[PDB]
């Protein structure tokens, strides 16, 4: 699965386009402000607190937990600053709704923001974990009450989450050479470039319901999924770049596959979940069997913070499958982890993920930075405080959905391209068939000439020229031929209608050349 | 190795003590405030900027680079805020001393603090690289002009750096099963618990000059180090917990080892260098053969930020050793990196480190968070703006050295323990021979009785009992029997004389019991 040599070369002309072209991710041009500014205040307050113990030039000291809430509340000015009012409300919420001690929460956030200590414990800060658990539940579990039975491991984005997942599955003999794994259409190729995937046999599954059937999944795709040899199902839900969440038939098919094979392991990458109304996590459907990979990146516009989370149920299939390995393998895993833990046989996979991430020896200084964890906690709190529709929505979320949909409509109306307006489209990316569009406007003869004579780089360099730029960030091509791929995250809203019209100009210009 | 089960059990009674007891690190109880407060301001300013493009509820937009420096300076209030004056001074220095464009440096710091974009490039932000390169040079390279020819890869602490380092050495066939690697005494055991190290033969090397010899290194230690079979040298300099930088003799020996074997690979973990005057980095002595691992953690009181840096010379031994591998090994490495880069055969090791860290496929969203990189940039600027003694010192560094040295003296004077007041001691940790101390005060019969039935855990529990705590954080034991290990980073300065005075009390109680029976 090598990246197009041409797309790699095109990125040399403008590296800013490299992530969308070659990594396949749309970087948002919006940010959420509230958590970012709340973080600032925690640091300011913490520095002030620290000078009470040591105060020498630019050196301060340490912070005492006793009475910290009272001192923070006194330091804040909720009448002047929205961040300050948010900090008080968030701490009080943690107390009244989550049952947490206000001093411990404030101390965690302040020490965490100031960043004066190694992450303790290694896997996740204790108050933060409870916050993220409840946030994930509101956001994506619907009526599944799992927040109290779920363990979390914050990571350096969903990027680090996936790298750690694959490594720990290999190290723990859960994925072995020759194992068959199911992946959802369209396969997110950056994941397939992880070297170890070459040792596994990959099976692409299409769980969409077609009119071909009585609006149901192809029997053949169902059998591929329910194959007793599929050891793990790795999915991106909603999909990149097709932008669709799994509907009821797809979620039912998955639950049936687990009913059939209780040992099935599932990793679900759900970063785009919040962009669809009434999102239902795969973890909420089959929690025993699922590793949930969440990323704050796209909703909150914090791709630079590297904020991901791995979620596992306290009772799960990864731990049970390790328990059913051969004494020989179990004896190798006993030794692997005994160097650093007293009872390695009962060490949970969520903790092995953390040990594995720093090669066992450096496990006791493992963990995501405390500033990243507090950022995760604060973004999480903005939601917990303002959620609607059972936890699915919040005012910021509503704005984010409207922003990507407006960009999408703008592009599609300007280009006269077919729109998907269902509640299952995130509208984060668009895939437009330029060949079908060229045939509609000019005819079959032009399409064939275009099909035979189309170079994607020439197209993108001509588009860049129309906009007086070297290369347009957020426009490229999908896996299929003549399938234009656009991100509604990357450009200013007003650029979308403009790109749409520019594409029709290019197609005319190609038609006049054809003649 | 294996962590001691008793110490691991002792930790489960006060988890706060685990990092020191079992990971061997003293978490500082001080912080630098300036870089932290300046970061804060960049976020405030960047949110303000972001609201110029999109402003809807708690959603803002993006930041335009043109004119950003002028807008930042107008936003700040240097007359009121020390952070603000620093930000202006820091930016102007980048311009006049580093020759950087101010809108670009400002846009890099603000976009970076707001954290609105993936790290680009993946390995290191361009301006931050130059800033950190010059900071490292000042702090540890002395007269070696290497800042313009060094490549940096910021990591999630020296913890991540070491992990990435060993992994990439294995992936690139530079360290193979059965290879012999030299390590400096005392060995840092958490590194030895990396699984792949089970497969290499580890040689401990002692580069201390003794009275036994003519105040020079033992001949058998120089033999071991210069052994043609040693493929790599892995060192913590200055050492933890011995807290000593390599002297001239030790640095000469390493330079001679490199002359004798030009393919020798060195990894030098120099997190404690700023704690000794006139520190001389190994990278500054033998730059072609050395990978430098630095951490901002201990000096800046930022262990929570997770700020590490890997440094390699643009022309290094790692890249050369890779170019001299088999046709079959080179072909495998080609296929490895070709999925993500056009010219894999010429991909530098520093870049391979970054690509390997995210298992090849996720290389284009690899790299350290931009807030972390900007924090490294800001801590670097604090020093560059205020450095003295050729770059080695600065006012904050002079305060940190004084703090650990004061806690060290307090401890030793209280306990009547012998001190090392040399220019080579960081004073970060102390190792005090309790058996020797017991003999001096009460005689050999008592020493022998103590040695025969001394239990470390019960001694630590009695010490905590005296302080009204479950377990004292920053007090434990070294590798040798009867050597108390203390961190001058963990406790208030007032606690040090108190601890030493309590160790003497505990020895007296042991002596009274010895005598009673």
In DSSP notation, A222-258 reads: HHHHS-TTEEEEEEESS-TTT-B---HHHHHHHHHHH
Cα gap B156→B79, rounded to integer Å: 35
The answer to whether B115 touches B60, Cβ cutoff 8 Å, is: no
> Do B477 and B433 share a structural domain?
yes
Residues of chain A in contact with residue B473, where contact means CB-CB under 8 angstroms, are: none
> Do A260 and A372 share a structural domain?
no
Experimental method: X-ray
The verdict on a CB contact (< 8 Å) between B57 and A399 is: yes
Q: Does B68 touch chain A (CB under 8 A)?
A: no
User: What is the least distance, in Å, from the CA of A219 to any CA of chain B?
Assistant: 32
Q: Is the dihedral of CA B406, B407, B412, B414 positive or negative?
A: positive
Tokens at A261, concatenated? 């094979």
Residue that is last in its domain, among B391, B406, B436: B391
> Do B412 and B431 share a structural domain?
yes
Of A36, A59, A120, the CB nearest to B32: A59
CATH of the domain at B128: 1.10.20.110
> Do A274 and A301 share a structural domain?
yes
> Do B190 and B119 share a structural domain?
no
Residues of chain B in contact with residue A19, where contact means CB-CB under 8 angstroms, are: 118, 120, 364-365
> Do A413 and A340 share a structural domain?
no
| Of B76, B86, B88, B91, the residue nearest B46 (C-alpha) | B76
> Do B212 and B357 share a structural domain?
yes
Residues of chain A in contact with residue B16, where contact means CB-CB under 8 angstroms, are: 120
Tokens at A453, concatenated? 């004579």
> Do A381 and A345 share a structural domain?
no
Cα gap A108→B164, rounded to integer Å: 29
CA distances, A157 to each of A295, B223, B269, B395, B498 (Å): 6, 47, 27, 37, 45
Contacts of B40 (CB under 8 A, 6+ apart): A40, A43, A44, B83
> Do A282 and A422 share a structural domain?
no
Range of the domain at A166: 146-365
The answer to whether B16 touches A107, Cβ cutoff 8 Å, is: no
CATH of the domain at A271: 3.40.640.10
DSSP collapsed to 3 states, B30-73: CEECHHHHHHHHHHHHHHHHHCCCCEECCEECCCCCCCHHHHHH
Of B22, B189, B304, the CB nearest to A371: B304
- Return the DSSP state at B379: H
Tokens at A269, concatenated? 């990458």
Q: Does A193 touch chain B (CB under 8 A)?
A: yes
> Do B377 and B343 share a structural domain?
no
Expressed in percent and rounded to 5, the helix, strand and coil fractions of chain B are 50, 15, 35
Residues of chain B in contact with residue A371, where contact means CB-CB under 8 angstroms, are: 304-305, 371-372
Strand partners, B155: B308
The verdict on a CB contact (< 8 Å) between A364 and B19 is: yes
Rounded to the nearest 10 degrees, what angle do helices B34-50 and B102-114 cross at? 90
Residues of chain A in contact with residue B49, where contact means CB-CB under 8 angstroms, are: none
Number of residues written out for chain A: 515
Tokens at A245, concatenated? 């969440």
User: What is the least distance, in Å, from the CA of B383 to any CA of chain A?
Assistant: 11
Interface of B with A in 271-310 (CB under 8 A): 301-306
Q: Which residue of A has its CA nearest to B191?
A: A361
Q: Does B479 touch chain A (CB under 8 A)?
A: no
Total tally of structural domains belonging to chain A? 3
| Of B137, B142, B138, the residue nearest B391 (C-alpha) | B138
Cα gap B253→B259, rounded to integer Å: 10
> Do B469 and B379 share a structural domain?
no
Tokens at B470, concatenated? 């479950």
CATH of the domain at A414: 3.90.1150.10
Q: Does A159 touch chain B (CB under 8 A)?
A: yes
> Do B220 and B276 share a structural domain?
yes
To one decimal, the resolution in angstroms is 2.2
Kindly state the helix (H) or strand (E) to which residue B308 belongs, with its residue range: strand B307-313
The verdict on a CB contact (< 8 Å) between A37 and B47 is: yes
Q: Does B85 touch chain A (CB under 8 A)?
A: no
């Amino acid at each position: 699965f090598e990246i197009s040599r041409k797309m790699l070369a095109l990125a040399q002309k403008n590296e800013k386009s490299n992530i969308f072209l070659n990594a396949g991710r749309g970087n948002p041009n919006w940010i959420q402000t509230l958590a970012r500014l709340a973080f600032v205040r925690l640091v300011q307050f913490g520095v002030t607190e620290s000078k009470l113990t040591i105060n020498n030039g630019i050196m301060a000291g340490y912070i005492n937990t006793d009475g910290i809430r009272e001192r923070l509340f006194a330091f804040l000015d909720p009448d002047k600053n929205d961040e300050d009012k948010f900090l008080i409300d968030a701490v009080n919420y943690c107390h009244t709704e989550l049952g947490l001690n206000r001093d411990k929460v404030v101390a965690e956030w302040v020490n965490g923001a100031v960043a004066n200590n190694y992450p303790v414990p290694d896997r996740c800060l204790v108050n933060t974990e409870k916050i993220i658990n409840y946030f994930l539940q509101e956001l994506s579990y619907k009526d599944a009450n799992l927040a109290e039975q779920t363990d979390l491991f914050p990571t350096e984005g969903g990027t680090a989450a996936i790298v750690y997942a694959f490594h720990s599955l290999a190290e723990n003999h859960l994925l072995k050479k020759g194992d068959k794994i199911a992946i959802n259409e369209p396969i997110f190729t950056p994941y397939l470039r992880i070297p170890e995937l070459k040792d596994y046999e990959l099976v692409e599954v299409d769980l969409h319901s077609y009119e071909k059937n009585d609006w149901e999944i192809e029997p053949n795709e169902i059998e591929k999924l329910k194959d007793p040899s599929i050891k793990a199902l790795i999915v991106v839900n909603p999909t990149n770049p097709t932008s669709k969440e799994f509907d009821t038939n797809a979620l039912n098919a998955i639950k049936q596959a687990v009913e059939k094979n209780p040992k099935l392991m599932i990793i679900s990458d759900e970063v785009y979940g919040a962009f669809v109304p009434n999102f239902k996590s795969i973890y909420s459907v089959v929690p025993y069997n699922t590793m949930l990979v969440y990323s704050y990146s796209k909703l909150f516009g914090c791709t630079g913070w590297r904020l991901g989370v791995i979620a596992l149920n306290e009772k799960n299939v990864f731990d049970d499958n390790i328990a059913h390995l051969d004494k020989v393998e179990l004896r190798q895993l006993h030794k692997r982890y005994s160097s650093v833990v007293l009872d390695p046989d009962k060490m949970k996979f969520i903790d092995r993920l953390c040990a594995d991430s720093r090669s066992i020896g450096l496990y006791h200084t493992a963990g995501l930075s405390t500033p990243q964890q507090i950022m995760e906690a604060l973004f999480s709190m903005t939601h917990l405080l303002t959620s609607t529709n059972g936890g699915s929505d919040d005012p910021y979320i509503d704005i984010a959905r409207k922003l990507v949909s407006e960009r999408y409509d703008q592009l599609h109306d300007a280009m006269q391209a077919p729109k998907d307006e269902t509640d299952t489209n995130t509208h984060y990316y668009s895939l437009i068939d330029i060949y079908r569009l060229a045939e509609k406007i000019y005819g079959k003869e032009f399409r064939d000439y275009l099909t035979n004579n189309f170079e994607q780089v020439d197209f993108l360099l001509k588009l860049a020229e129309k906009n007086g730029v070297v290369l347009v960030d957020g426009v490229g091509f999908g896996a299929k031929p003549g399938e234009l791929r656009v991100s509604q995250a990357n450009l200013p809203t007003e650029d979308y209608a403009l790109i749409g019209k520019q594409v029709l100009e290019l197609l005319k210009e190609y038609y006049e050349e054809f003649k």
